[PDB]
Enzyme design. Structure first.
Site, PDB file in Angstrom:
ATOM      1  N   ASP A   1      47.905   7.539  45.825  1.00 40.49           N
ATOM      2  CA  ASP A   1      48.093   6.099  45.623  1.00 40.49           C
ATOM      3  C   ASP A   1      49.488   5.634  46.082  1.00 40.49           C
ATOM      4  O   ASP A   1      50.505   6.209  45.667  1.00 40.49           O
ATOM      5  CB  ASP A   1      47.901   5.783  44.132  1.00 40.49           C
ATOM      6  CG  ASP A   1      48.034   4.317  43.823  1.00 40.49           C
ATOM      7  OD1 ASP A   1      47.230   3.510  44.346  1.00 40.49           O
ATOM      8  OD2 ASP A   1      48.940   3.978  43.041  1.00 40.49           O
TER       9      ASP A   1
ATOM     10  N   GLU B   1      47.280   6.796  50.912  1.00 37.74           N
ATOM     11  CA  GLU B   1      47.161   5.342  50.931  1.00 37.74           C
ATOM     12  C   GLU B   1      48.522   4.802  51.354  1.00 37.74           C
ATOM     13  O   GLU B   1      49.373   4.535  50.511  1.00 37.74           O
ATOM     14  CB  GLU B   1      46.806   4.797  49.541  1.00 37.74           C
ATOM     15  CG  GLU B   1      46.534   3.315  49.551  1.00 37.74           C
ATOM     16  CD  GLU B   1      46.476   2.706  48.158  1.00 37.74           C
ATOM     17  OE1 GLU B   1      47.152   3.239  47.249  1.00 37.74           O
ATOM     18  OE2 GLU B   1      45.784   1.676  47.982  1.00 37.74           O
TER      19      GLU B   1
END
Length: 558
Positions: free
Chosen positions: A199, A253
């Site tokens: 993330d 990401e």
């Protein structure tokens, strides 16, 4: 080109909270995922990526972690988790989990200790700074609203949070922090997880001395946050000390990262990450300053981005390809046409694109059914903390009118992909026996899994067929990608070629029937699949008559 299971695999993303509830509390859980593994196996899925499953106060639905070694209460037990891994292994499926280490919950033990006193051993696990003239340390804005600095009256200092105030950023510059994070990763990897999705992986490294952002930088600050002078040193260190010791797939990401800088995270020679998650395509029509607002786009723009993303990955990197996920609106609504007359065909067309790109395709739960955006009316119908942040910064300040704001967030909100998965036509689409944590879209009576699984011409079964085709054709995973005409705003066409094998993919994005002559004396050998039929294609054909939203895959002669 080197073969990797993760380049050929078809991934399916499960948002636990909204997949399947098995104990009637309205919240999806791990036993629900296990209960549907046969459904996913019938679909043809090779691996599942689940959003955060760790203990969390849920200010950001799982992305604010209170305890990295504990299962979120609502989702189940460590027992349920190990069983999920095992039931998946039985079905030859690999599990990928979400790694959220840019920040933690402010209820995380490290932060509770960190904020207790300026001399606590864990003070350095986060970023603390004195006020500047009774104000915040600098002008850093938060992605989730207001300043990125939160005042703590006990110690008289502010702590940094790129995201919610309940999500303080970790101090990666502190060696002890990295070591504790590596230990946490080994805890999960030793349980047999097959992949890790990082993330906002590009914001770990902060800017030395936290200098103010220029007036211009303020209009695109994410880009400034990804310029940490040690981000790659850190990602590579994590590779050497942890990642390289297991046979896994890692996705990054890279939020805020310009496409030209993306390759440094995924070049296989750099020993950093494996699969790139870029935002260039999925948010091509999003304003970079007022990040909640959307603007018109054209196919030529869409395909030109795909080509750039493809060339940037090039020979040593690798891309993931998806048109939606839990942070974006539904694919059929965003990139197709969700009106009753066009939803299924446009849905099938996006399915074709998705499974035939030179990248690892990721399918988001429910999009294999053609689920759509949810018809939000009033601002209080949204659940997302991000939405609330934008509303405060832009509407409550009187900068933007409420109606115009709502017109846009109805189209861009992350919540559009968080409504409960529509399993059947029963109360609440069979998602729960209780009351859904988030309202179910009323269209579940027309769009649901039980109905489509037994219907051979369903969207679900179109995905199933395409997943089988990609599994059977090496060219569709590894074949070079060539766009036949990057400036064409009507018909999207490209070839995928491996050795003597060459395939063509075509999608008529127009509402009108289109005749499309192939270039370079290319001719059709045979139809692999097409959304039509009765639209007879013969060997040696070089002109395709395409009905609105028609799409297909063909093997080319030679």
């Amino acid at each position: 080109t080197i073969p990797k299971w993760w380049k050929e695999a078809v991934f399916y993303q499960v948002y636990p909270r909204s997949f399947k509830d098995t104990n009637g509390d309205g919240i999806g859980d791990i036993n629900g995922i296990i209960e549907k593994l046969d459904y996913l196996k019938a679909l043809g899925i090779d691996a599942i990526w689940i959003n955060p499953h760790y203990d969390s106060p849920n200010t950001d639905n799982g992305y604010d972690i209170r305890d990295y070694r504990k299962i979120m209460k609502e989702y189940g037990t460590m027992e349920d988790f190990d069983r999920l891994i095992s039931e998946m292994k039985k079905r030859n499926m690999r599990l990928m989990i979400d790694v959220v280490i840019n920040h933690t919950s402010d209820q995380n033990e490290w932060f509770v200790k960190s904020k207790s006193s300026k001399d606590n051993p864990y003070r350095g696990y986060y970023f603390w700074k004195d006020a500047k003239e009774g104000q915040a340390p600098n002008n850093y804005p938060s992605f989730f609203g207001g300043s990125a600095w939160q005042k703590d009256e006990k110690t008289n200092q502010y702590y940094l949070h790129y995201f919610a105030k309940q999500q303080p950023d970790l101090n990666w510059d502190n060696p002890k922090v990295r070591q504790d994070l590596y230990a946490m990763l080994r805890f999960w990897l030793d349980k047999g997880v097959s992949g890790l999705r990082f993330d906002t992986v590009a914001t770990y490294s902060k800017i030395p001395d936290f200098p103010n952002l220029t007036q211009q930088q303020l209009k695109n600050f994410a880009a400034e946050y990804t310029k940490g002078p040690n981000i790659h040193r850190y990602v590579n260190e994590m590779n050497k000390e942890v990642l390289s010791h297991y046979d896994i797939a890692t996705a990054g990401e890279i939020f805020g990262v310009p496409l030209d800088q993306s390759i440094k995270f995924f070049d296989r020679r750099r020993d950093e990450l494996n699969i790139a998650f870029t935002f260039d395509l999925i948010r091509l029509d999003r304003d970079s300053d007022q990040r909640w607002r959307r603007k018109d786009w054209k196919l030529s723009q869409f395909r030109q981005i795909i080509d750039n993303v493809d060339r940037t990955a090039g020979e040593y990197g690798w891309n993931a390809f998806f048109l939606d996920n839990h942070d974006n609106p539904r694919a059929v609504s965003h990139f197709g046409d969700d009106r009753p007359q066009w939803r299924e065909p446009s849905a099938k067309a996006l399915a074709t694109l998705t499974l035939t790109q030179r990248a690892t395709p990721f399918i988001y739960q429910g999009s294999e059914l053609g689920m759509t955006n949810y018809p939000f009316k009033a601002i209080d119908e949204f659940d997302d903390i991000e939405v609330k942040g934008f509303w405060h910064d832009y509407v409550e300040t009187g900068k933007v009118k409420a109606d115009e704001f709502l017109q846009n967030v109805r189209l861009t909100s992350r919540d559009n992909s968080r409504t409960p998965f529509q399993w059947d036509g029963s109360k609440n689409a069979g998602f729960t026996s209780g009351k859904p944590w988030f309202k179910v879209n009323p269209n579940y009576q027309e769009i649901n899994a039980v109905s489509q699984v037994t219907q051979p011409d369903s969207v679900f079964n179109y995905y199933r067929q395409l997943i089988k085709i990609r599994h059977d054709i090496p060219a569709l995973t590894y074949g070079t990608y060539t766009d036949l005409d990057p400036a064409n705003d009507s018909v999207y066409a490209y070839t995928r070629s491996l050795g003597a094998e060459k395939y063509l993919v075509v999608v008529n994005f127009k509402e009108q029937m289109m005749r499309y002559k192939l270039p370079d004396n290319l001719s059709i050998e045979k139809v692999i699949i097409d959304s039509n039929s009765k639209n007879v294609v013969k060997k040696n054909d070089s002109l395709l008559e395409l009905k609105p939203w028609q799409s297909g895959v063909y093997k080319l002669n030679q």
